[PDB]
Amino acid sequence: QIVLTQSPAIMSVSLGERVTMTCTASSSVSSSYLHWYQQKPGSSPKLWIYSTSNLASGVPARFSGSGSGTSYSLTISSMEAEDAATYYCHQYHRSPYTFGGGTKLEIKR
Amino acid sequence: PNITNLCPFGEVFNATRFASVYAWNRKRISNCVADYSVLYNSASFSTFKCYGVSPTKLNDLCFTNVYADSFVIRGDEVRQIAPGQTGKIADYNYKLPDDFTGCVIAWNSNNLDSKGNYNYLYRLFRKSNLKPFERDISTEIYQAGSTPCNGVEGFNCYFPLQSYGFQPTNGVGYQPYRVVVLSFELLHAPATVCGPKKS
Amino acid sequence: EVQLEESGGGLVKPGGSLKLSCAASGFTFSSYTMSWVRQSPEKRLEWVAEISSGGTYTNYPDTATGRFTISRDNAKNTLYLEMSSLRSEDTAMYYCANFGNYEEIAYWGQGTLVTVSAA
């Protein structure tokens, strides 16, 4: 199988700016099989960005990103108070299904 | 007349292997009389979609220059094969003009293409849209910037194709579907293929 | 729909076998492939094992090849999952969700704490 690796472990990034996050793998997975959930603390994950380009319901068109091959990028526009959550990479192409390493997104005052 | 000539639509509809979408199989059928009732009267064909002519009067009319297009795609995008729609398959792998005079048949092939299976490709990146019925065959390292990269993939250098994970235990929309698109012209030349005449 | 109620969990012994039943109602279960995932406390997610409702097919990762069993029941719309000879290292909390079905993947379970105990 292919293990999903996240280049940054945690982002202690202040409020307002615009950064990017990366999902890296040992080989290309698909143009559109991967997706990202959002596990809130003490809750269940929810999917926003599917097909590596499209967006699920409830997204204010603020969360975006693009990529293909062995590395994919997910971008933001401007940080706000509700961005303090968790994100998980995914891959559905091989027999075995794995998840991303995860990033503990946090804001700084 | 006693005996009427017929052409083998069965081998088109019953074939062991189909071509991928980015290299779609194209065939020409002429000088035959093939019944069209047997197609939509069957049950295996999950989708029998077309508007230019009703199934009832398929056999009533006569046509010329029958062309058949065959390929295998993912289920969740069967809607994309129609006159005037967008999408990756509808822009970089196949094009359907709005002024389309033909019909579309699509059916599941879960037990014929499963494991798992990886040998499956399709065009992902292309300069722009395609002209109607264009065959888009090429192999180039598309670059998402201005720096020229050749020979090997690199940063902002992307591989044009991508495969499909047709796992045997997938749900609806992920199982491979076989699609056959029929096109023709309405007797612009001396008649070549007509319907079966009653006796 | 009412979002995939899982069978209640609890503390067990290292050597028992707990059963998780993800019964539900609200959408067709003859064409929706279910899946079981677990999360250990503050650790990456891991797909435990999935089922295929099209022909009720079983396939799941090789990290534990012979100790995972899934039984589907479309009649009363229930999803049994169990493991054989659970260990004290298998403490986690489990979700039953929808994988492989219609493109719009959603409806993760409410979660159930299935932990082990030694006291």
Residue numbers in the entry:
A (entry chain L): 1 to 109
B (entry chain A): 330 to 444, 447 to 530
C (entry chain H): 1 to 119
What does the primary publication say about this deposited structure?
SARS-CoV-2 infection is initiated by the engagement of the spike (S) protein receptor-binding domain (RBD) to the host receptor molecule, angiotensin-converting enzyme 2 (ACE2). Most neutralizing antibodies (nAbs) therefore target the RBD to compete with ACE2 and prevent viral entry. Here, we report the generation and characterization of a series of chimeric antibodies against the receptor-binding domain (RBD) of the severe acute respiratory syndrome coronavirus 2 (SARS-CoV-2) spike protein. To reveal the structural basis of how the distinct classes of the RBD-chAbs recognize the SARS-CoV-2 S protein, we determined the cryo-EM structures of RBD-chAb-25 and -45 in complex with the ectodomain of the SARS-CoV-2 S protein.
In both cases, the chAbs bound to the SARS-CoV-2 S protein in a 3:3 stoichiometry, indicated by the three distinct EM densities protruding from the three RBDs, which were all in the open conformation. Focused refinement of the cryo-EM maps by masking the Fab and RBD to yield a better definition of the binding interface, thus enabling de novo model building of the Fabs and the S protein to define the atomic details of the epitopes of individual RBD-chAbs. Detailed structural analysis showed that RBD-chAb-25 bound to the RBD via an extensive intermolecular hydrogen bond network around Y453 and N501. Specifically, Y453, Q493 and R403 of the RBD were hydrogen bonded to S31L, S28L and S32L of RBD-chAb-25 (subscript L denotes the light chain), respectively. Additionally, G502 (adjacent to N501) of the RBD and N101H of RBD-chAb-25 (subscript H denotes the heavy chain) formed a backbone-to-backbone hydrogen bond. A cluster of bipartite hydrogen bonds was also formed at the interface of the light chain (Y97L) and heavy chain (E50H and N59H) of RBD-chAb-25, with Q498 and T500 of the RBD. The overall binding interfaces between the RBD and the light/heavy chains of RBD-chAb-25 were 511 Å2 and 350 Å2, respectively. Nearly all of the antibodies retain the ability to recognize most common mutation variants, with only RBD-chAb-25 showing poor binding to the N501Y mutant. Although the K417N mutation is located within the binding epitope of RBD-chAb25, it is at the edge of the binding surface, and RBD-chAb25 still retains the ability to bind the RBD. The crystal structure of one of the antibodies, B38, has an epitope that largely overlaps with the ACE2 binding interface, which is similar to the epitope of RBD-chAb-25 in our study.
